[PDB]
Scaffold this active site. Structure first.
Site, PDB file in Angstrom:
ATOM      1  N   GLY A 137       4.728   1.082   1.037  1.00 58.61           N
ATOM      2  CA  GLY A 137       5.498   1.801   0.035  1.00 58.61           C
ATOM      3  C   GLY A 137       5.967   3.180   0.443  1.00 58.61           C
ATOM      4  N   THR A 141       0.840  -1.246   0.000  1.00 54.57           N
ATOM      5  CA  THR A 141       0.000   0.000   0.000  1.00 54.57           C
ATOM      6  C   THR A 141       0.859   1.276   0.000  1.00 54.57           C
ATOM      7  OG1 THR A 141      -1.803  -1.115   1.244  1.00 54.57           O
ATOM      8  CG2 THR A 141      -1.848   1.311   1.179  1.00 54.57           C
ATOM      9  N   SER A 142       0.438   2.258  -0.789  1.00 57.10           N
ATOM     10  CA  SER A 142       1.038   3.589  -0.785  1.00 57.10           C
ATOM     11  C   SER A 142      -0.105   4.600  -0.776  1.00 57.10           C
ATOM     12  CB  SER A 142       1.928   3.796  -2.006  1.00 57.10           C
ATOM     13  OG  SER A 142       2.937   2.811  -2.057  1.00 57.10           O
TER      14      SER A 142
END
Ligand SMILES: *[C@@H](CS(C)(=O)=O)[C@H](Cc1ccc(CN)cc1)NC(=O)[C@H](CC(C)C)NC(=O)[C@H](CC(C)C)NC(=O)c1cnccn1
Ligand SMILES: [Cl-]
Ligand SMILES: [Mg+2]
Ligand SMILES: [Mg+2]
Lengths: 231, 250, 204, 243, 244, 241, 196, 223
Positions: free
Chosen positions: G130, G1-2
């Site tokens: 991320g 995940t970012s």
């Protein structure tokens, strides 16, 4: 009349008859006087005996090292309320390392007594209390009625014939308030005040009960030959 | 803020009457006439949509209710009591039966569960009895078609045909003369409409009459295809148009 | 340690033409020790038959439970429960113990009294239904029974042929499992007669 | 008859006689008022000096809720305290969850629902207090008054207790003569006057004035008591107006 | 508070009677008569339905005679809905006993359990008692054939022949007159129907009005059979005994 | 005669406490009216501020229950607010559990079922209020559903509530007898409000200023109340034709 | 995940990738990690999908009920409700939520709530696996009071790097713009952002 | 298990294989993995078989009662919300992985639900041990505005990919087609590519081959 069967019922004129009847149990109770100066606060109580064989019913109860009360009315109810006060005084000490304020003690008693007047099944407390104490803002005297009304006073009296003592203190107000750093003279004024409520009987050695709290004085009760000095 | 009524509000009077049940039956008597007739190949239940105002949309008020796909109910008396009983009846059909046996309960047992709920209002603490009589019509594989009446007391009786509420005495006499054991469903619907005309004062049409049947399986109303065993609901509420068609042949 | 294989034992059920068969071995053991050679695993509630393998205490407990439930069913419904409905009752009852299950492998067998249709079903310990057309297996030699049934079975066997097939499936499976055997029972079920046969087998 | 013997019983009128009897207890109590000003509110109360033995300035009747709400009431004083204790619990749990201090209309309903709940059952007594309360929130100043029935409205000026008719008349004049509004310091003075004028109904015993106020400019939106020179300035103003 | 409206169902009168039990018994006295007669080779249960309508579906109907297990049945007099609560409890107590001991419940144990439940409602809880009297007919391998009755007080007693509901005074006099100890089921059937036929408030006793049942140890090979009579079978037995 | 104090049956089969809750409904002496347009539902109500000390902005018997649902009450305000808060809670809980906005009629049924429980259970009194729920439902379109202390509820083409409801009802009845449709055939809600106000003026025989009325309007995806100035614009338009 | 949320002159922008993985398998390559708890209060979700959804649903319920009673809630109020749930159930949750919202009074506000259930009000926030790779980049490039076009580029370039290096991040870059003008959704495809 | 669901022009379609396995063995060759929830809402279940069956049945019961209460067609989002809230509560201990699809007054919908309570929105999805085989096919061939005929082909292909290449999946292909404004059509055994080949020999035994110790009649009747 029809509206006095329980505490939950208002009358047509906005009265709670069960509370007023509980108030009546105080008037039947034996007289007790409270008064204070800036340094000390005093309780004086006329204890009542059943007959000549019996002991004289104890009127004064200690709540903490710096606070206690005298009672007039149902003694078991005073035991309940005093025991509740002891616990609140104790809670303040243990949790906050702080002696409970006398004004705040009054607020707690008011709210405990109130719950009994608004709910079904319960009854009002059938007792009036005079709380004395010395805290971080000096000497204090409180009058508790079981309607919930708690009142901070210089002096007062409750019980049978208490109006005589209460008129005396009302006159003496300017004198006794100035009795600073002199416990014995403050007790004298309380003993002279309670004498105004006597008829036929007089203050004997096992009749009288006095308590005091102040600046460098823990709440201590005097009975028996300890109060012969003041008769 | 307490429920202190943990004692029965319905009790035996000296004469042996249960007052609150009798009074609940009196409320049922004041209620609008509803009826039920059992045929050989179906059951019909019917009632008047007594509209409280002409501004009200009486379609929204369903006096005749689906309980299971094969069971329907109608009432006389207090509408709000009926509505909540229908809610509980629908749920009890799932909780105490369908989630155990994987099939809908038979008519008599669902009736038994409704009867139980109404009995409990007659004995439990702090409640009045339900002020309704229910007529429950239904079908199941092993009992066939059936019609039951359920009273405020919790008592229930199976009927060939009956009526409850306002003009029930006159309506039951009318049904006794007309009913036989060889009736087809259409014949019962015809008799239902005749009987119900006697107790209705004002307008008499598909918009002022509510009428449903327990009949043949309706695979068209099922909503899906691909399971041969699920053939569709036997309960069907007749449309406003379908009622008016039969009123011309009346 | 594994509850399903402390006591041991097997149940197999098969369909035929207008009939069903259900069979079981008679062993109850404490792992290696044989204890009883009369522990029957097949019960019946009216005309519906229930075989149960696995932990023996649960076998007994569930029999007592389904007797209880079907008795009340009959008093309220005023008729005997059918196999399809009973299957659902078994599933319901096992899944309500989802997180503390009965360590069993139940098998329902019977003929629907109204439709006359032969019916068999099996379950895992938490109630998932396997409603097979051909056969159902259960127990400690279930692998062996699968191997016998899958080769030996053919559809629409007559009652007296079906007996031979289900018996030979049971016997040869049980002889390849340490924890099964010690005798065997075979019920042949028809719409209104049921024959029960005890089989002769090697007693080791 | 018998409809007035139990709380939560409708009379044939559609009245709850027990609630109307609670109002008689409120009417019996001392006069209290509230005045909404430009950027805040001012509360005042009549405290009857029953005896010389009462300690002056000690038996405080006005109560703070959270830091930004004031509450005053007339009638059974303990009932008023029980309601404020509840209010404090409500204001605390609101702030705990929603971070922001409770808005005044939001707070007003929390009391209003609670008081109303005590008219729903025969196992409880209605409240024997009319409560005047309010303060400053993000949308500005608010003043409310709440009856034994649980009925409450927003007010420009509010009054309850034995001298209410007298007070109401005086408040009605302030509303007419100051449409653009009243300043916080003005309201303190007028409050003192109105309690003094309303004391003709309780004229047998002398009394003690007590005033509090929230104001965005004068108190930073926080509830504070009027003390010392500002209290004395209001008492002087009030004494001048009666003479 | 609520006290005002409490009937106080569980109190004694000055005379030492339980008001609500007595009034429930008065309720039961208006209910349709139920008769139980015990013979050496079986028990009879006969009962009169209360609601004669031609439109009542009689063959699927059950207001009087209920089955508790395979060995024990009851006849009901009073509120049917109340009886059905108790019946479902008694059915469960039977099955709990069967699950625990692997033996059918003895008749007196089931009767005592129900009677104790009824008793509970008269002593505590503040609810109205069950407006139900039962006649229990049953068999077990200890005492054989047994008749009992229970009433709303929770008192139960054993009988050779007994009536509950309406005209029990007239009915018990007639039973006491014609009953004998060596009697047989067929004779008891006749006695039961003759008794109802004289005590009925109706103009004549017909099949559509009756529920009828026998418990016989005259099943195949020494078992016990419960027979709840179908409407046609009641009609036959009415012609056989010569009432219609 | 304790059958008149709690919710049990009288010998006649009547619940006197429910009947007296209905009489409490008119204690406010306020008349409400609801009508339906094509795209909207309008509810109007009389607003009476007898005291000059009252803040007139806080005097309201109209409540925004959800975005899509509005509720006008006839009856005392404590019960009105009791019913409002509960309805809001029910409308939020519904959305959370079932994943779509609670319909108007479903809320009405829910509140009715609650009102039923007070007529059956003795410890709870009925609320002395008639709740008129309004929305533009996404499935049913413009919707008026009304609940009372008895637990009765029904949909409406239009409705009126209060002391003089019969006069308003008959006025509305006569208009829909002419038009022969279930609604006000009008595009803009502004004109539907003008209709509502006009037909209340005719029925009650009284003129209104901007501060004598209170208006609520339901459109698709929102319900909102009109300010005094929005109402004034309405009143001007009525007077000009 | 970012995931990231960035305050700028006209309000605030939330940005996220669209990749959800179960180990090395990409279970959903077009996930919507920007989720609406109120009209102009959104949040970015990282951690357990089950948890962050269950939380976001409860918050939406609370703010809906708040709105019925007390009018529009502040972005601070929303962040406090998120916190309350995350903090009190910290032992049973794996949720990292960035709350972002637009008042007219307060303008754009961003609150981050990491694993502990603490709350931190920030000018911008980055989170998810991320994010570790772009602390250097985001710190060097962020400025306060950027325009809308600058903020979109900043987020685009940032998450582009996050996606490049983190296997757990990927797919499309979703954005949600919150201003007085309203709510605008933006999407940016691999062929756009990868060549940056 | 191999389950898939995808959307097409005016509808949604579900697919599933028919193999249920315990450990390494095949317990069922023809099980229904498409569960009824409402007339136009269906659910594909993979994971623990009892958990997946039981969860759908419960929500389907509660959906029915909700529908009756509200007098409305149930919505797929209602099922989705009720399923996820139940599954979340149990923290994955109900090991049911579902693809929920349907039609309602809102339109057509497609969602996946994982055992821990997370939900996804997609135009094509697949779950179970064969999801990777199925997703490979969906990713290679899925496009926008599929016709019903293309959709059924693609759904059945995605399931088949699982059947052949995944050991967990096998036997037949079940399909359900939910189209807007039409009755949902449930197509059990849509494909049958794994019929057993005829056996070389018949193992029917000569009668009397089995040795028997005793015989008896069982009394199954009442009384
Ligand atoms: C396929 C799921 S997979 C391997 O994750 O892709 C399949 C799904 C399924 C099967 C049947 C139905 C019918 N209602 C619905 C959904 N699931 C199974 O095959 C499971 C796989 C297990 C969980 C690994 N099998 C079971 O649940 C079986 C019961 C079946 C045969 C009815 N039970 C067990 O495997 C088992 C093991 N240990 C203890 C208990 N049960
Ligand atoms: Cl409800
Ligand atoms: Mg062996
Ligand atoms: Mg051996």
């Amino acid at each position: 009349n029809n509206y006095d069967g329980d505490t939950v019922t208002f009358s047509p004129t906005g009265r709670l008859f069960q509370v007023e009847y509980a108030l009546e149990a105080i008037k039947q109770g034996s007289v007790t006087v409270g008064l204070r100066s800036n340094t000390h606060a005093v309780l004086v109580a006329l204890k009542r005996n059943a007959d000549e064989l019996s002991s004289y019913q104890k009127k004064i109860i200690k709540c903490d090292e710096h606070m206690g009360l005298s009672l007039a009315g149902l003694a078991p109810d005073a035991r309940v309320l005093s025991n509740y006060l002891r616990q609140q005084c104790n809670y303040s000490s243990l949790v906050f390392n702080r002696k409970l304020a006398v004004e705040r003690a009054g607020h707690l008693l008011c709210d405990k007594a109130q719950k009994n007047t608004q709910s079904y099944g319960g009854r009002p407390y059938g007792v009036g209390l005079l709380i004395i104490g010395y805290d971080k803002s000096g000497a204090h005297l409180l009058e508790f009625q079981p309607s919930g009304n708690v009142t901070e006073l210089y002096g007062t009296a409750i019980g049978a014939r208490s109006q005589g003592a209460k008129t005396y203190l009302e006159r003496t107000l300017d004198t006794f308030i100035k009795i600073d750093g002199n416990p014995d003279e403050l007790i004298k004024a309380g003993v002279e005040a309670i004498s105004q409520s006597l008829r036929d009987e007089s203050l004997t050695v096992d009749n009288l009960s006095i308590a005091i709290v102040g600046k460098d004085t823990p709440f201590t009760i005097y009975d028996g030959e300890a109060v012969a000095k003041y008769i | 803020m307490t429920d202190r009524y943990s004692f029965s509000l319905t009790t035996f009077s000296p004469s042996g009457k249960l007052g609150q049940i009798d009074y609940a039956l009196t409320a049922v008597k004041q209620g609008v006439t509803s009826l039920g007739i059992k045929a050989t190949n179906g059951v019909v239940i019917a009632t008047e949509k007594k509209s409280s105002s002409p501004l009200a949309m009486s379609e929204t008020l369903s006096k005749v209710s689906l309980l299971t796909p094969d069971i329907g109910a109608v009432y006389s008396g207090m509408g709000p009591d009926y509505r909540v009983l229908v809610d509980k009846s629908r749920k009890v059909a799932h909780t105490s039966y369908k989630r155990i046996y994987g099939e809908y309960p038979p008519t008599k047992l669902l009736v038994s569960e409704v009867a139980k709920i109404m009995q409990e209002a007659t004995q439990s603490g702090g409640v009045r009895p339900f002020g309704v009589s229910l007529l429950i019509a239904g079908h199941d594989e092993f009992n066939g078609f059936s019609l039951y009446q359920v009273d405020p007391s919790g008592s229930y009786f199976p009927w060939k045909a009956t009526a409850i509420g306002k003009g029930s005495v006159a309506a039951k006499t009318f049904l006794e003369k007309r009913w036989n054991d060889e009736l087809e469903l259409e014949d019962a619907i015809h008799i239902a409409l005749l009987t119900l005309k006697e107790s209705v004062e004002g307008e008499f049409n598909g918009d002022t009459i509510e009428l449903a049947i327990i009949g043949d399986e309706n695979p068209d109303l099922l909503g899906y295809t691909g399971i041969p065993t699920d053939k569709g609901p036997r309960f069907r509420k007749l449309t406003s148009q379908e009622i008016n068609d039969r009123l011309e042949a009346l | 340690s594994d509850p399903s294989s402390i006591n041991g034992g097997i149940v197999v059920a098969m369909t035929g033409k207008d009939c069903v068969a259900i069979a079981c071995d008679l062993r109850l053991g404490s792992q290696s020790l044989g204890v009883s050679n009369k522990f029957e695993k097949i019960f019946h509630y009216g005309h519906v038959f229930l075989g149960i393998t696995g932990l023996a205490t649960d076998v007994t407990t569930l029999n007592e439970m389904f007797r209880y439930k079907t008795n009340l069913y009959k008093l309220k419904e005023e008729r005997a429960i059918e196999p399809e409905t009973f299957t659902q009752l078994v599933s319901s009852s096992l899944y309500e113990r989802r997180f503390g299950p009965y360590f069993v492998g139940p098998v329902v067998a019977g003929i629907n009294s109204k439709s006359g249709k032969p019916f068999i079903a099996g379950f895992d310990l938490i109630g998932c239904i396997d409603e097979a057309k051909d056969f159902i297996v259960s127990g400690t030699a279930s692998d062996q029974l699968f191997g016998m049934c899958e080769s030996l079975y053919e559809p629409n066997l007559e009652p007296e042929d079906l007996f031979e097939t289900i018996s030979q499936a049971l016997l040869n499976a049980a002889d390849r499992d340490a924890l099964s055997g010690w005798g065997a029972v075979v019920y042949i079920i028809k719409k209104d007669e049921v024959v029960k046969r005890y089989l002769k087998m090697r007693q080791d | 008859t018998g409809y007035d013997l139990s709380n939560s019983v409708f009379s044939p009128d559609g009245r709850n006689f027990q609630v109307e009897y609670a109002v008689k207890a409120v009417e019996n109590g001392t006069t209290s008022i509230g005045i909404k000003c430009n950027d805040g509110v001012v509360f005042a109360v009549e405290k009857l000096i029953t005896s010389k033995l009462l300690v002056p300035q000690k038996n405080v009747k006005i109560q703070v809720v959270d830091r930004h709400i004031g509450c005053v009431y007339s009638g059974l004083i303990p009932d008023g305290r029980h309601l404020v204790n509840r209010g404090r619990e409500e204001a605390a749990s609101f702030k705990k969850l929603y971070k922001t201090p409770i808005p005044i209309p939001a707070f007003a309903d929390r009391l209003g629902q609670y008081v109303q709940a005590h008219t729903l059952y025969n196992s409880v007594r209605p409240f024997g207090v009319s409560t005047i309360f309010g303060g400053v929130d993000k949308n500005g100043a608010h003043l409310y008054m709440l009856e034994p029935s649980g009925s409450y409205w927003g007010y420009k000026g509010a009054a309850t207790g034995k001298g209410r008719q007298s007070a109401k008349a005086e408040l009605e004049k302030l509303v007419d003569h100051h449409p653009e509004g009243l300043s916080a310091r003005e309201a303190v003075k007028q409050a003192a006057k109105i309690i003094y004028l309303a004391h003709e109904d309780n004229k047998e015993k002398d009394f003690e004035l007590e005033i509090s106020w929230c104001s965005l400019s004068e108190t930073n939106g926080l509830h504070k008591f009027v003390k010392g020179d500002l209290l004395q300035e209001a008492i002087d103003f009030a004494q001048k107006e009666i003479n | 508070g609520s006290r005002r409206y409490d009937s106080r169902t569980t109190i004694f009168s000055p005379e030492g009677r339980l008001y609500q039990v007595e009034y429930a018994l008065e309720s039961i006295s208006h209910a349709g008569t139920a008769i139980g007669i015990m013979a050496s080779d079986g028990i009879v249960l006969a009962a009169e339905r209360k609601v004669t309508s031609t439109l009542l579906e009689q063959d699927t109907s059950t207001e009087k005679l209920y089955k508790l297990n395979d060995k024990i049945a009851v006849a009901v007099a009073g509120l049917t809905a109340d009886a059905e609560i108790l019946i479902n409890t008694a059915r469960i107590h039977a099955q709990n006993y069967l699950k625990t001991y692997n033996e059918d419940i003895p008749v007196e144990i089931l009767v005592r359990r129900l009677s104790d439940i009824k008793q509970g409602y008269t002593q505590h809880g503040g609810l109205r008692p069950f407006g139900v009297s039962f006649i229990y007919a049953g068999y077990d391998d200890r005492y054989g054939y047994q008749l009992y009755t229970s009433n709303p007080s929770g008192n139960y007693t054993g009988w050779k022949a007994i009536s509950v509901g309406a005209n029990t005074s007239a009915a018990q006099t007639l039973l006491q007159m014609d009953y004998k100890d060596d009697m047989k089921v067929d004779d008891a059937i006749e006695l039961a129907l003759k008794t109802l036929s004289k005590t009925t408030d109706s103009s004549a006793l017909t099949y559509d009005r009756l529920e009828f049942a026998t418990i016989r140890k005259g099943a195949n090979d020494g078992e016990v059979y419960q027979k709840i009579f179908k409407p046609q079978e009641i009609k036959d037995i009415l012609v056989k005994t010569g009432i219609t | 005669g304790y059958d008149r104090h709690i919710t049990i049956f009288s010998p006649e089969g009547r619940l006197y406490q429910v009947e007296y809750a209905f009489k409490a409904t008119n204690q406010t002496n306020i008349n409400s009216l609801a009508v339906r347009g094509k795209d909207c539902t309008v509810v109007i109500s009389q607003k009476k501020v007898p005291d000059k000390l009252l803040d007139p902005t806080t005097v309201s018997y109209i409540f925004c229950i959800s975005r899509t649902i509005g509720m006008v009450v006839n009856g005392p305000i404590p019960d009105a607010r009791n019913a409002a808060l509960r309805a809001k809670a029910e409308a939020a809980e519904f959305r959370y559990k079932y994943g779509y906005d609670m319909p108007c009629d479903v809320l009405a049924k829910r509140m009715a079922n609650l009102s039923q429980i007070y007529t059956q259970r003795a410890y709870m009194r009925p609320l002395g209020v008639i709740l008129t729920f309004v929305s533009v439902d996404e499935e049913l379109g413009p919707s008026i559903y009304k609940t009372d202390p008895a637990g009765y509820y029904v949909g409406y083409k239009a409705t009126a509530t209060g002391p003089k409801q019969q006069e308003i009802t008959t006025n509305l009845e006569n208009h829909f007898k002419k038009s022969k449709i279930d609604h006000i055939n009008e595009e803009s809600w502004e004109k539907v409000v003008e209709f509502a106000i006009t037909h209340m003026i005719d029925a009650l025989g009284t003129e209104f200023s901007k501060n004598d009325l209170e208006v609520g309007v339901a459109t698709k995806d929102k319900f909102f109340t009109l300010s005094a100035e929005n109402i004034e614009e309405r009143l001007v338009a009525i007077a000009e034709q | 995940t970012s995931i990231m949320a960035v305050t700028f002159k006209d309000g605030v922008i939330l940005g996220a990738d669209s990749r959800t993985t179960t180990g090395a398998y990409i279970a959903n390559r077009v996930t919507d990690k920007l989720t609406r708890v109120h009209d102009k209060i959104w949040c970015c979700r990282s951690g357990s999908a089950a948890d962050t959804q269950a939380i976001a649903d409860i918050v939406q319920y609370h703010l809906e009920l708040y709105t019925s009673q007390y009018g529009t809630p502040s972005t601070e109020t929303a962040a406090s409700v998120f916190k309350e749930l995350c903090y009190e159930n910290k032992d049973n949750l794996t949720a990292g939520i960035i709350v972002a919202g637009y008042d007219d009074k307060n303008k754009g506000e961003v609150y981050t709530i990491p694993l502990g259930g603490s709350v931190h009000k920030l000018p911008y926030a980055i989170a998810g696996s991320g994010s570790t790779f772009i602390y250097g980049y985001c710190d060097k490039n962020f400025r306060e009071n950027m325009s809308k076009e600058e903020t979109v580029d900043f987020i685009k370039h940032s998450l582009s790097q996050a996606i490049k290096w983190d296997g757990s991040s990927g797919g499309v870059i979703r954005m949600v713009v919150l201003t007085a003008a309203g709510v605008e959704r933006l999407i940016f495809y691999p062929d756009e952002y990868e060549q940056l | 298990t191999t389950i898939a669901g995808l959307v097409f022009q005016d509808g949604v379609i579900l697919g599933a294989d028919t193999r249920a396995t315990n450990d390494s063995v095949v317990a069922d060759k023809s099980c229904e993995k498409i569960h009824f929830i409402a007339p136009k809402i269906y659910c594909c279940g993979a994971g623990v078989a009892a958990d997946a069956e039981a969860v759908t049945q419960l929500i389907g019961s509660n959906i029915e009662l909700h529908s009756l209460y509200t007098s409305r067609e149930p919505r797929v989002v209602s099922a989705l919300q009720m399923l996820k809230q139940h599954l979340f509560k149990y923290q994955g201990h109900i090991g049911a992985y579902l693809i929920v699809a349907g039609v309602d007054p809102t339109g057509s919908h497609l969602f996946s639900i994982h055992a821990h309570g997370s939900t996804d929105v997609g135009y094509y999805l697949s779950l179970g041990s064969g999801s990777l085989a199925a997703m490979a096919v969906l990713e290679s061939h899925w496009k926008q505005d599929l016709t019903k005929e293309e959709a059924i082909k693609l759904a059945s292909d995605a399931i088949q990919a699982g059947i052949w290449n995944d050991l967990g999946s096998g036997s037949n292909v079940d399909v359900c087609v939910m189209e807007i404004g039409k009755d949902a059509e449930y197509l059990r055994n849509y494909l049958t590519p794994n019929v057993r080949e005829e056996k070389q020999k018949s193992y029917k035994f000569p009668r009397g081959t089995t040795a028997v110790l005793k015989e008896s009649i069982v009394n199954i009747c009442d009384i």
